[PDB]
Every structure is written in C-alpha cells, then in structure tokens.
Amino acid sequence: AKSAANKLDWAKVISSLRITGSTATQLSSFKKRNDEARRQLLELQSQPTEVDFSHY
Amino acid sequence: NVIQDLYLRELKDTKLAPSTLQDAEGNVKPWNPPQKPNLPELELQGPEALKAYTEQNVETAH
Amino acid sequence: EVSSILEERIKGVSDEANLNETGRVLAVGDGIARVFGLNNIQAEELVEFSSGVKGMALNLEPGQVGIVLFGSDRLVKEGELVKRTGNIVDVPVGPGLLGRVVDALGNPIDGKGPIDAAGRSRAQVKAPGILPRRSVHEPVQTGLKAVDALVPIGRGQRELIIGDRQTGKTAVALDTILNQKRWNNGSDESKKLYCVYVAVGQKRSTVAQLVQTLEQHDAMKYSIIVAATASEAAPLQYLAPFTAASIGEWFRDNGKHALIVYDDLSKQAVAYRQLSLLLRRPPGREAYPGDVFYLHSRLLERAAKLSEKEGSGSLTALPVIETQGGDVSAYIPTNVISITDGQIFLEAELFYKGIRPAINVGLSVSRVGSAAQVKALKQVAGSLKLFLAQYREVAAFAQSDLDASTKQTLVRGERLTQLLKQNQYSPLATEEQVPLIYAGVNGHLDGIELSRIGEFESSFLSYLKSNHNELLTEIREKGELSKELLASLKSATESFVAT
Amino acid sequence: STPITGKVTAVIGAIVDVHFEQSELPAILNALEIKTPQGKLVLEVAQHLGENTVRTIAMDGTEGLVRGEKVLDTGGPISVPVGRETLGRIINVIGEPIDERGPIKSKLRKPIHADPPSFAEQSTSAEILETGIKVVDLLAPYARGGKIGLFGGAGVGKTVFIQELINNIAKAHGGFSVFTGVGERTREGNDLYREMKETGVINLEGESKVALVFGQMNEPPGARARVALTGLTIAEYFRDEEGQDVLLFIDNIFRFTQAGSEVSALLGRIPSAVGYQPTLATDMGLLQERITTTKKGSVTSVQAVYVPADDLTDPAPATTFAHLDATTVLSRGISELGIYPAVDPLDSKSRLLDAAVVGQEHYDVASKVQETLQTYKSLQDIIAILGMDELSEQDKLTVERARKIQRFLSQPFAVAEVFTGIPGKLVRLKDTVASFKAVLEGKYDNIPEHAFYMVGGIEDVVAKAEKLAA
Amino acid sequence: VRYEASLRQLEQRQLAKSVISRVQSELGNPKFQEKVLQQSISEIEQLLSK
C-alpha cells in the first residue's frame, strides 16, 4: 500500500534515468506521498464520535 | 449583633433560585449539528484525461 | 455553605476603638499617609488602618507620623482612623514553617493554614556577637562538583552568588537544595539544613514553577519559601529578607543548621529605593539609598556559625545579586562584594559554550573556603585547582603548531572541563564526587576520549557501584581517604579506565 | 448634580487639582468626569492633598480649562464595557469606540484596574506553542499562556514581527486575541486596521476573532499610562467570564514605562534612576502579575519592547527582562546581514527550553546548533586578523556548517510578501528538528550556502539546490 | 461544566447584593433608632468597663 508506493517510487528513480525529461515521475511520487502522509496523520488524529455522558 | 440582625434576615429571607438553562447556555458554548464527511466527485472525465496522459508523456529521452 | 461564611462574620464581631491613640489621616497620597495622632507609637510599629491596611512608621516627624502603607491605595482615603496595633514588626517563628510556603506576613500562600509557629520575633534583631560565634568547621555539600571542591562552602557562612540575569541564577541555587534532601533525610540537626528560599520580587507564576519542582523533588518537608512576589508591596519586599532571617533565627537558636538563600537582594535594593524616594529621603550613590549598605550588612551578619555555648548551630547563607549585564561595579554590587566572604561568578560565555550550569571559577573565590571542606575531598582536589589554572593560560594557545607540554596541559584541561559539566537538577553525593575527581587527578581520564568523558562518568559510577560498593561505603563512612583506600580506588579506576 | 462636586483649583498641565467640598472626598483611583465642550475630561484620582483638595492626573487634553469648574464623580477606576461584542471594535483609552461601529454593546462593565490573582489561582504552564518559525521553534520554543517578549530596538519592524505572529498563531488558534497598541503611530494604526480587515481576523461582516484597543502616541501621557490596564481587563472578561484562551498582544511597552516616567515627574515624584519612575518596578509588576493562566483561561501575552540605543542594560528594558517568560532579542545587526528573522540566536532564550521538556533529541540538536554558531562567531575574529589558514579542518567544517545554518534560519514570511514578495514558509517544529539535524549530520552540506538563504525546510533547500544547479 | 461550577461561586455574589438591600432596610427601619440606642448603651457599658 504505502510501502508498495515507496518501493515503486525508488524503482522509478532508476526508471527516470531511462528517459530524460522526467518531471512527472516526481509529480506522481510527490503528490501521492504528500497526501498519503497527510491522510495518515489525519487518521492518527482521528477522534471517533464520542463524548462524555458518564463523567461529565 | 448588628451582624446577627443582618444575618438572620439575609440567610432566612434571601435564597437565590438557580438561573435558567438559557442563561447558563449563553455563558457556555452552544452546540450545533455539523453535516457531511465531505462530498468529493469523480476526477477527470472522458478521453480528455486518456488522450492527455498518453500524449503528454513525451518525457522520453531526446 | 452560606452559613459558614456568615458564622465567620459573626465570629468577626467585637468592636470598640478603645485605644489610647488612634490617628486620623491628614492626606494620603503616594501610599504615604501622613497621620495626625499616634503620639505614642514605637519606631516602625505595625499600625492597622480603618481599611485594615498595615503600615510601618519609618518617619516619625514632629507633628505627623508618615505611615507607609503595605496595602492598596484605593481603600484608603483621608481622615480615616488609624488604629495602633502596638507591636513592632514581628513574624511568627517556629518549626511549623517546614514545608510551608508563606508570604511576608506569614499567611500561607500555599494555603496550608495557620503556621505551627511558637513565637513572634521581630523583623530586625541584632546579630550574634564575637563570643556567640565559633569558627566554621562543618562543610555543606551542594552536590555540584566544582562548587564543593573549587569553592568549598562551610556552614554559617555567606558567600555571594553574583551573576548574569536569569541565566538560571535561581537554578544554581536550587541544585544545592536538592542535595540537602539527602543530608536532611539523615539524622543530627546539623546535617538537617532546613533550607529557606527567599523569593524576592518574583512573579507568582515563576514561584509556582519553583513550588511544583520542589514538591516533585520532595523538598517541601524542610523547605520554607518566604515569598514576597512581584505583586507584593514594596514595604513587604523591603522587609522580606529581614523577616526571613528571623525564621532562620529560630532554627539557628535551637542549635540546628539551615541554609537561607536571599534571592535577589538587587530587587530588595530597588524596593528600598522606592521607599526612600517616596519618603523623600535622598537616594544614595547610583540612586540607591545611602544606608542600603547598613541594611544589607545587618541582614547578612545575622547568618553565622554560633558558638558551642550558644548551642552549636548556624544559619548558612547564600545571597544572590543580579548583575546589570555583568557589571560588578555599581554601588549595590561593590557594597555587597565588600560584605560577602566569598563570591561565585557565573560566566555567560561558558553557558553558551555548553557548561550549563555555567560557573567561572576564576572569578569565583572563597575567603573561608577549604577551612570547611571534606578531608577526603581536600586530598583529591589540590591538583585540580592548579591543573585548571594552567588550562586557562593554555586556553588561548589552543588557537596551530603547539609545544607538547602545552598540548598535554590542553588535553588534561579539556577533559576536566567536560567532566566538571553539571546536569541541572541532578545533585551528587561526596562519596561519588571523590572517585570521579580522583580519576582525573590521576590523569586516567587523559586517555579517555572527550566524547566518551560523559559516558565514562556514569559507567564508572555504575562499575564502582556494583564492583566496589565497599569502596563507596568506605568513602562515605570514613570521610577521609586512607592510603589503602586510595590504592584500591586507583586499581578500580585503572580497571574501569581500561575498558 | 453629584454632591461630590469639586471645583478645579490649579491647572498645572495633567496635574489638575480639584476642590471637593465637605463630607465628600473620592477614594484613590476614582474616575472623575468633568463636563466640557471637549466631552468629559476623565481624571484619575491619584492623591488626596487634604482639605478636600485632591490631585488628579488628566487622561484627555487639558487645553481650554477654566479654574473652578464643577467636577462630577463617576467614582472608582474608569469602567469600560466588556462583553461578547467587543470583538471587532477598536476602542480608545476611555472605552469608547473609535471605529464608528456605534456604542459597544455592554453586557458588563468592569474597572480598568483589577487586582492581580493570588498564588492559589496560578496554574503551572507546560503547553508548547509552535509558531512554525524555525528560530523560535528550534532555538527558543514558545509556550501557551506565556509572556513572550520581543525585545529589540527600533528599525527591526517590531510591529512586522507581531503581524507575522497574528497571521500564524492567531489564525491557527481558535481562541480570541486582543491587540493592544500603547502609544503607537496612526500610520501603524491605519495599517493594522486595514491589514486585519484584509486578513479577515477583523471580519466586519459577522464578528472578528480579535478586539482592538488603539492607544496612540498623540494621546496625552496619562492616557498612555493607563491604556495597558484597560486592554488587560477586556482579556480578563474573555479569560474569566467567557472561559476562553486569549492571545494578548501589546505594543510597545517602552511607551508604557516612558509614559509612567512622565507622570511621575508631573506628580512631583523626583525622577529615579536613569530618569525612570520610582514606581517602575511596581507598575511593571502590576501588569505582569495580572496576566496569568487561571483555571478559567490561559492568556498568552506577546509584548513588544523598545530598547533605547540597543542598551538593554538601560533600567527600563532591564527591569522588564526579568518579568517576561520567553525573551527574544531581534538585533539590528543580524537584520542588516539580511537574515530575516532578525533574531540573534545566541541572544534569545526562553524558560521553556528545558531539555526533556522540549524533547531530549530537540534539545541536543539545538545545543549542537548553538555550539556550532558560538564557535563560528568566535572564529570570525580569528579569520579577521589571522585568516582562515589557522583554522583546522574540523574548525573549518564547523564554520561551513554554521554559515549554512546561519542562512538556513533565513526564511521568508507572509508579511514580507509586502516587503519583498516571497510567500512565508511555515515550517512545523517537528520538521525543523529533523531538517536541522540533517544539516549537522552533513547530509545537506553538499548544498550551497546561498541555497540555504531565505528559504524554507530541508526539502526546499534541496529544491533550491536544484534551482541554482539549473 | 465550567458555568456549572461558576454558578455556585456567582450565587454568593448574587446573595451579596441582597445583603446590601437588607442594609438599606435596616438603616431605614427604627432598627436605625433602636439598635443605635443599643449600640449607645453597649458602648456606655464598654466604656464603663474601662
């Protein structure tokens, strides 16, 4: 998933060597990583819909 | 003595009934019901994307 | 409930202004009520206003006595009756103040209720005489290696702590207190130093940090914090060290020992300045009252090691003076420097250079010093002063093509400096100070790599603790390093050094 | 009208003595209003001189005063209105709107003087603000509920620094803010009004997430002294009554000291050291002590300070230096070197910097940075006379890292889109620790010095390396 | 929760202004005459005890 994404990214660095003009390997990799890390921390900052109704 | 007179009258005759829920409500955060997880929609439509991706890749070595 | 508060007011009944003298304010401006009345009035007597404000009577002028308010102006207004408390300023003194944070009046600001104090004794009381003092012979151990060896501190002794503003000046002080917990736990009241921190002009938030840290380190149970906070009025701030000293006198008088840290007398000075200026009494040199020398000296001479006929007790003291950007020349520093016997001068460069806490031991001096020092610690620390002295000189020869002798000195010195770094809020015991210094003295740390000095230190301590806790126990109990003990210790040091 | 009618006796500037009659004598710190064709002159009662003749300080102008003029007593310290609707109002010293959104809607009124809260009330701070500004985050992290102190001289655009803070911290933060300007320029006032109308912090449609109290330097000195106290009470209403956390902001507090010095002189209190008021300490103390993190609310003051001729040993800055939690010194020199932020990193320390508290790793990294920079500053002297030839390879590597670090700190800000054009780099604290760590490890010591200059984080530094490369 | 705690504190201040109202009643009543006479005779007694 996320580990697949990054493994394929590093594979793509040496793929980007194969063809000069690469500038959208970087756009794909950067874009997927950026929003991936953001959604991952979004999921880590997830507070399920819960409230006190016992303590408070 | 004078304190006693004041006290007797004060304690006995003066009692506050707790404030309305509205007054408390005003002095605290109100609460409102939010909506939606988020509604996004499908990405690029048609063969505009399809043609664009095949063609745009000209990032081939020169 | 509502009842308890009302019942409290009912308890607060009693009235009659039957007092030989009352006063009536003539005019009140600037917190200097000028009162017509109070014909009989002791000098600096506590007076209670109609508004319950308390005051002292610094100026007894022939027709009017210019009371200085300890309270807020707003309540006071002209004409108002000024009841005469009839008691010169006195504060409760007694054993109750152990683990109690009290304000200047004595009122617990930690709200631990009425003090279990057995007397009220005056704010200013004349200092012990010639014969009421015996020469110092008991050291106190701060748990700071450099201080204990380089700047040895006795008991009933006052050495200055003059240094740069908020460089954890308060931190340097606090470290000493932490080592006093260990000794405090121990028996003999001489070993039980009941520390007093006198927080002068310090905001309540800062003191809250102190209080919690002290509670964290369990220090509250011998600690006393006499607090005159930033908010607290300039009379309270002025009288705060004097008041504090009296608390110390009770412990001292009972023959016990204690350590009082006046922090910082510089803000006390400012408060006296405020008082003087408001009383229109001319301000001395550098606009700080002229007889500030007399006040500070009186305070600082009430800290002493009493004689054995006076019950073998003391009040060790450590005043703190805040330098005005490292200015040790200035009327208040010069005066205090003269009064104090010893100085500790923290160096800002050293702080930046990672000696945190930072001390510059060139500009630290002890004028009583090694007269009270652990005998063991004397043995293993003459060399250290000299080595470091050489290290200072060859410091500036450390900028290319270097002679072997200088380079050797430089190596020994650099390792020592790293060793003498102190980790704030961690004190040390003498039985663990001496091995570390011994190693350095024997130059066994000359070989140890600089990065590994830090690692070495703790490792050596653990190695000693497991292997040679006989040695540690011997060091602790003997208090002197026997040749056999130094032999074994050297062996142990070599063995650990080898690994 | 009021039986408590007083007749002016002496107009000696701000000192105006009033002659209240018999059996009537306002208490100290009261507020008198005098009907005038200049509205109500407000007089703060500051002394009683006896014989029912008080000596009061004027707040408003003193021109066109005629002796023997009837003086009504409003009593107690000037009481402004406070309320939920105070947000989105610019309020002058006497508590009256100066943004012509009509009269402020009073829920409550309170006096502008308020007693400092006791030891018991204080709650011990530990929360860490993260401004997203590298120098602040790494080398002197800020704390919520703090008393941040922006020591600097003039010229360092003190207001500009605060504007960046409002953009970052305020917008991010949910709580309200109070922007208080003590004796500041009407150029600055107009700019601030416009700028926060634009940034929508002041959103005229609906409410604002801030209230403003603009006290300006043309206002008479008495008003300059007592603007600060006023602003604080508005914050107290939020803090206490509305139970909010407030980002207080005050500007420039030297004006507060200076103002007090003037009226000390006028009060006849002979000027104390370096011409500063003898009550400097207690006035400072009253301001700082009032501000605290109560159980009802945490207030984070950011106070600008003007350090005359960059001498912070001058008693007015030096006295403040003790009283504030999280000092920063923005040195002119560093600004001139082109490093924006202009913070001098070896002269900027905060109480919250304690090793494990700010993260043991964070501390160690920052300690390494500091040592590296301190070495660099010392070695500049060696380079100056001796040359760079007497620096060892190790020393040279430390210098190269320091030069890179020095300009790694340089980063643009949103408020120097105006000054320059570059949009600010909000670089998170965690990211900064990592990014600075990388440099020290030497992972980006293969990146040119100027590709560290005036840019963001490590990723950006790599990108700018590519930019210089091609 | 915050206002819930607050209301308990606030109530005492609400009850405080009611004491003031009761003060206005006391000083209006011939408690103003009779209890002032009580203060007078009590003061006579205090001063006699000197």
From Swiss-Prot, chain A:
Identify this protein by name.
ATP synthase subunit d, mitochondrial
Q: Can the keyword DNA-binding be found in this entry's annotation?
A: no
GO cellular component: a single term? proton-transporting ATP synthase complex
Which keywords does this chain's UniProt record carry? Acetylation, ATP synthesis, CF(0), Hydrogen ion transport, Ion transport, Membrane, Mitochondrion, Mitochondrion inner membrane, Transport
Any idea where this protein resides? Mitochondrion; Mitochondrion inner membrane
- Which family is annotated? Belongs to the ATPase d subunit family.
Q: Which residues of the intact protein are shown?
A: 4 to 59 of 174
Q: What else is known?
A: Present with 6820 molecules/cell in log phase SD medium.
Q: Which organism is it from?
A: Saccharomyces cerevisiae (strain ATCC 204508 / S288c)
Q: What is the documented function of this protein? A: Mitochondrial membrane ATP synthase (F(1)F(0) ATP synthase or Complex V) produces ATP from ADP in the presence of a proton gradient across the membrane which is generated by electron transport complexes of the respiratory chain. F-type ATPases consist of two structural domains, F(1) - containing the extramembraneous catalytic core, and F(0) - containing the membrane proton channel, linked together by a central stalk and a peripheral stalk. During catalysis, ATP synthesis in the catalytic domain of F(1) is coupled via a rotary mechanism of the central stalk subunits to proton translocation.
Keyword match Glycoprotein: no
Q: Which GO terms describe its molecular function?
A: proton transmembrane transporter activity
Which biological process annotations from GO are given for this protein? proton motive force-driven ATP synthesis
UniProtKB/Swiss-Prot annotation, chain B:
Q: Which GO BP terms sit in this record?
A: cristae formation; mitochondrial proton-transporting ATP synthase complex assembly; proton motive force-driven ATP synthesis; proton transmembrane transport
Q: Give the location in the cell.
A: Mitochondrion; Mitochondrion inner membrane
UniProt keyword Glycoprotein present: no
**A GO CC term assigned to this protein in UniProt:** mitochondrion
- Primary location group: mitochondrion
Going by the UniProt record, its keywords in alphabetical order are: ATP synthesis, CF(0), Hydrogen ion transport, Ion transport, Membrane, Mitochondrion, Mitochondrion inner membrane, Transit peptide, Transport
Main role?
Answer: Mitochondrial membrane ATP synthase (F(1)F(0) ATP synthase or Complex V) produces ATP from ADP in the presence of a proton gradient across the membrane which is generated by electron transport complexes of the respiratory chain. F-type ATPases consist of two structural domains, F(1) - containing the extramembraneous catalytic core and F(0) - containing the membrane proton channel, linked together by a central stalk and a peripheral stalk. During catalysis, ATP synthesis in the catalytic domain of F(1) is coupled via a rotary mechanism of the central stalk subunits to proton translocation.
Q: How does it assemble?
A: F-type ATPases have 2 components, CF(1) - the catalytic core - and CF(0) - the membrane proton channel. In yeast, the dimeric form of ATP synthase consists of 17 polypeptides: alpha, beta, gamma, delta, epsilon, 4 (B), 5 (OSCP), 6 (A), 8, 9 (C), d, E (Tim11), f, g, h, i/j and k.
From Swiss-Prot, chain C:
Where in or outside the cell is it found? Answer: Mitochondrion inner membrane
Modified residues annotated as Phosphoserine in this record? 14, 135
CDD domains with a match to the protein in the record: ATP-synt_F1_alpha_C, ATP-synt_F1_alpha_N, F1-ATPase_alpha_CD
Taxonomy, superkingdom: Eukaryota
Q: Where does ATP bind?
A: 163-170
- Gene Ontology cellular-component annotations: cytosol; mitochondrial inner membrane; mitochondrial intermembrane space; mitochondrial nucleoid; mitochondrion; proton-transporting ATP synthase complex
* Effect on the protein of changing residue 340 to I: In ATP1-1; growth-defect
One biological process term in Gene Ontology: proton motive force-driven ATP synthesis
Which PROSITE patterns did the record assign? ATPASE_ALPHA_BETA
Q: What family does the database annotate? A: Belongs to the ATPase alpha/beta chains family.
Q: What does this protein do?
A: Mitochondrial membrane ATP synthase (F(1)F(0) ATP synthase or Complex V) produces ATP from ADP in the presence of a proton gradient across the membrane which is generated by electron transport complexes of the respiratory chain. F-type ATPases consist of two structural domains, F(1) - containing the extramembraneous catalytic core, and F(0) - containing the membrane proton channel, linked together by a central stalk and a peripheral stalk. During catalysis, ATP synthesis in the catalytic domain of F(1) is coupled via a rotary mechanism of the central stalk subunits to proton translocation.
Q: Which PANTHER family match?
A: ATP SYNTHASE SUBUNIT ALPHA, MITOCHONDRIAL (PTHR48082:SF2)
> What is the protein's given name?
ATP synthase subunit alpha, mitochondrial
Curated annotation (Swiss-Prot), chain D:
Quick one: a GO biological-process term for this protein? proton motive force-driven ATP synthesis
Q: What is its EC number?
A: 7.1.2.2
Q: Which residues form a coiled coil?
A: none
Q: What does this protein do?
A: Mitochondrial membrane ATP synthase (F(1)F(0) ATP synthase or Complex V) produces ATP from ADP in the presence of a proton gradient across the membrane which is generated by electron transport complexes of the respiratory chain. F-type ATPases consist of two structural domains, F(1) - containing the extramembraneous catalytic core, and F(0) - containing the membrane proton channel, linked together by a central stalk and a peripheral stalk. During catalysis, ATP synthesis in the catalytic domain of F(1) is coupled via a rotary mechanism of the central stalk subunits to proton translocation.
**Additional note from the record:** Present with 164000 molecules/cell in log phase SD medium.
| Highest taxon above the source species | Eukaryota
Q: Where in the cell is it found?
A: Mitochondrion; Mitochondrion inner membrane
Is Phosphoprotein one of the keywords UniProt gives this record?
yes
Q: Which family does it belong to?
A: Belongs to the ATPase alpha/beta chains family.
Its subunit composition reads:
F-type ATPases have 2 components, CF(1) - the catalytic core - and CF(0) - the membrane proton channel. CF(1) has five subunits: alpha(3), beta(3), gamma(1), delta(1), epsilon(1). CF(0) has three main subunits: a, b and c.
As its record notes, the protein acts as a catalyst of: ATP + H2O + 4 H(+)(in) = ADP + phosphate + 5 H(+)(out)
Which positions are annotated as binding ATP? Answer: 152-159
User: Which Gene Ontology cellular-component terms appear in the entry?
Assistant: cytosol; mitochondrial inner membrane; mitochondrial intermembrane space; mitochondrion; proton-transporting ATP synthase complex
Q: Where are the transmembrane segments?
A: none
According to the UniProt entry, which residues carry Phosphoserine? Answer: 335
Q: Which residues carry this modification: Phosphothreonine?
A: 74, 199
